[PDB]
Amino acid sequence: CPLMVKVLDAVRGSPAINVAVHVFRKAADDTWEPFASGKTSESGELHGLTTEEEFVEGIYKVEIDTKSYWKALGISPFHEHAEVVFTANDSGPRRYTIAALLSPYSYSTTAVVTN
Amino acid sequence: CPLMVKVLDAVRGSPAINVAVHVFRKAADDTWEPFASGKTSESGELHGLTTEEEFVEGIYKVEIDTKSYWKALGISPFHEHAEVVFTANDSGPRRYTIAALLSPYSYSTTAVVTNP
Amino acid sequence: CPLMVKVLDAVRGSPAINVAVHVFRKAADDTWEPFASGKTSESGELHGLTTEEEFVEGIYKVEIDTKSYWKALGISPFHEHAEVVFTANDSGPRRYTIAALLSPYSYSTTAVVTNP
Amino acid sequence: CPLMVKVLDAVRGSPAINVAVHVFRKAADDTWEPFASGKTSESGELHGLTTEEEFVEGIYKVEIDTKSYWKALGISPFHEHAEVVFTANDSGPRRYTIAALLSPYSYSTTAVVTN
Ligand SMILES: O=c1cc(-c2ccccc2)oc2cc(O)cc(O)c12
Numbered sequence: 001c002p003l004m005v006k007v008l009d010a011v012r013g014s015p016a017i018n019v020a021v022h023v024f025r026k027a028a029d030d031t032w033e034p035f036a037s038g039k040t041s042e043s044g045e046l047h048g049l050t051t052e053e054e055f056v057e058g059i060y061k062v063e064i065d066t067k068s069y070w071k072a073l074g075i076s077p078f079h080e081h082a083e084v085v086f087t088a089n090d091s092g093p094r095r096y097t098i099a100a101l102l103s104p105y106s107y108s109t110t111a112v113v114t115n
Numbered sequence: 116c117p118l119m120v121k122v123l124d125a126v127r128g129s130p131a132i133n134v135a136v137h138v139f140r141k142a143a144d145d146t147w148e149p150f151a152s153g154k155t156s157e158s159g160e161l162h163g164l165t166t167e168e169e170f171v172e173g174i175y176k177v178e179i180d181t182k183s184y185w186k187a188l189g190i191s192p193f194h195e196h197a198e199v200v201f202t203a204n205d206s207g208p209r210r211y212t213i214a215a216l217l218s219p220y221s222y223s224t225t226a227v228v229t230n231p
Numbered sequence: 232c233p234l235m236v237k238v239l240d241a242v243r244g245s246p247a248i249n250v251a252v253h254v255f256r257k258a259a260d261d262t263w264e265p266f267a268s269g270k271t272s273e274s275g276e277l278h279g280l281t282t283e284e285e286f287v288e289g290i291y292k293v294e295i296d297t298k299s300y301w302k303a304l305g306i307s308p309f310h311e312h313a314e315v316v317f318t319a320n321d322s323g324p325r326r327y328t329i330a331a332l333l334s335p336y337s338y339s340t341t342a343v344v345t346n347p
Numbered sequence: 348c349p350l351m352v353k354v355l356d357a358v359r360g361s362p363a364i365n366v367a368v369h370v371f372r373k374a375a376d377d378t379w380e381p382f383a384s385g386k387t388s389e390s391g392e393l394h395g396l397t398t399e400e401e402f403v404e405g406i407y408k409v410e411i412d413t414k415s416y417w418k419a420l421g422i423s424p425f426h427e428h429a430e431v432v433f434t435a436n437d438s439g440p441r442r443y444t445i446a447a448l449l450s451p452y453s454y455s456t457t458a459v460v461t462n
C-alpha cells in the first residue's frame with residue numbers, strides 16, 4: 001500500500017489504537033471525497049487504505065479522529081481531529097507514512113515518504 | 116483578543132513570517148464559513164483575527180498556509196497546509212493561541228488555551 | 232535578555248508553570264558547569280536566566296525538569312527531563328527562546344533564535 | 348530487544364539514516380556510562396542496542412547525534428544532539444521505542460512503550 005497512517009499517543013506512550021482515520025481525495029469541485037478509512041491497529045497503524053493503482057496524484061486529506069480517541073480515554077481534547085492534507089506526487093517517493101503524534105492539546109504530523 | 120496564531124519555522128529556528136492563515140467557522144448548515152484571515156507578522160504571530168464578541172462558540176478551522184511558506188523558501192513541503200480544527204468557547208470564552216511549528220514534512224500544532 | 236525558556240503543556244493546552252529549568256554551560260574541561268536556573272512563571276516562561284555579558288559563546292544545556300512537572304500533576308512521565316543542548320552565540324550574540332512542549336511520553340523542543 | 352530507537356527527518360520526510368545513537372546508563376555516581384550505540388538503519392531504526400537481561404531498571408540516556416546528521420545534510424542545526432533521558436521500569440511495558448523526529452531547530456521525542 002502506498003499510504004499508511006500511524007498514530008501514536010504522547011500521553012500514554014503507546015500506539016493510538018482504534019483511531020478512526022478517514023482519507024479523502026480532493027475532487028475537481030474542490031470538495032473532499034471520501035476515499036478510504038479505517039481504524040488504527042493495536043500498533044497504531046492503518047494499512048491497506050489504498051492501492052498503488054488507486055492512489056493517483058491528487059490532494060489527499062487524512063482525517064484522524066483524535067477527538068474520539070481522547071474522548072475514549074476520558075481526556076478533554078482540543079482538536080476536533082487532525083487533518084493531514086497533502087499532494088500525492090508521482091510516485092517517488094512511492095510510500096507515504098503519515099504519522100501523527102497525539103496529545104490532547106497538541107498534535108504533530110509527519111510524512112515519511114520512501115521508496 | 117481571543118484568537119492568536121503563532122507559526123514557527125523548525126528549519127530556521129525562527130518565526131514563520133508572512134504565513135497566510137485563514138480561519139473558518141463551521142456554520143449551522145455544517146459548511147466552513149470564512150471567519151477571518153491574516154498573515155503572520157515578523158514575530159510569526161497573527162493577532163487581531165477576531166474579537167471577544169465575534170468569537171462565539173463554534174467549531175473553528177485555522178488553516179495555515181504552510182505550503183506557500185515553504186515554497187517561498189524554495190522548499191516543496193509535504194503538507195498543503197496545517198489545519199487546526201477545534202471547538203472554541205464551549206465552556207465560556209477562552210483565549211486561544213494556536214501555535215504551529217513547521218517543518219517541510221512535519222508540523223505540530225498546539226493550543227494554549229487560557230481564561231479571559 | 233538572550234535566553235528564554237518557554238514550556239508548554241500539551242495535555243492541558245497551557246503554559247507549564249513552575250517548571251524547574253537548569254542551564255549548564257560546557258566548561259573548557261568538557262564538564263557541565265551550572266550556569267543558571269529558574270522556574271517557569273504562570274506564562275510558562277522563564278526569563279532573566281542570563282545577560283548578554285554572561286551568555287558568551289559556549290555549549291549550553293537547558294535541562295527542563297519535566298518529570299517533576301508531570302509528577303506534581305499525578306502523572307508518571309516517560310522522560311526524566313527535557314534536555315536542550317546547543318552551541319550558543321557562535322556567529323555572534325543571539326536571543327534564544329527554547330520552547331518545550333511537554334506530554335507525558337513525548338516532548339518537543341524548538342529554538343527560536345533571533346538577532347539582538 | 349527491549350529498546351529501539353527510531354529517528355525521522357522532518358525536513359526530508361524520511362527516516363533519518365546513519366544517525367549515531369549512544370545509550371548510556373546512569374551509574375551510581377550519577378555519571379553516564381556508555382551502554383550501547385549504533386547508527387540508525389535505512390529505516391531510521393536502531394535495533395539490538397540491548398537485551399532484556401542487560402536492560403535492567405535504571406536511568407538511561409539516549410543521545411542522538413542530530414548535529415552530525417544535519418551537518419551531513421548541509422543544514423545548520425541548533426542542537427548538539429537530542430538526549431532522551433528516562434527511567435526504564437520493570438518491565439511492563441517491556442519494549443521501548445524512542446522515536447525522535449528531527450528538524451534543524453527542533454526535535455520531538457516520544458516513547459512508545461509496549462508489551
Ligand atoms: O518555539 C515555539 C514552539 C512552539 C510549538 C508549537 C507547536 C508544537 C511544538 C512547539 O510553540 C511556541 C509558542 C510560543 O509562545 C513561543 C515559542 O517559541 C514556541
Ligand SMILES: O=c1cc(-c2ccccc2)oc2cc(O)cc(O)c12
Pocket residue numbers: 006008099100101108109110221353355444445446447448455457458459
Ligand atoms: O513514536 C513515534 C513518533 C512519531 C512521530 C510522528 C509525528 C510527530 C512526531 C513523532 O512517528 C513514529 C513513527 C514510527 O514508525 C514509530 C514511532 O514510534 C513513531
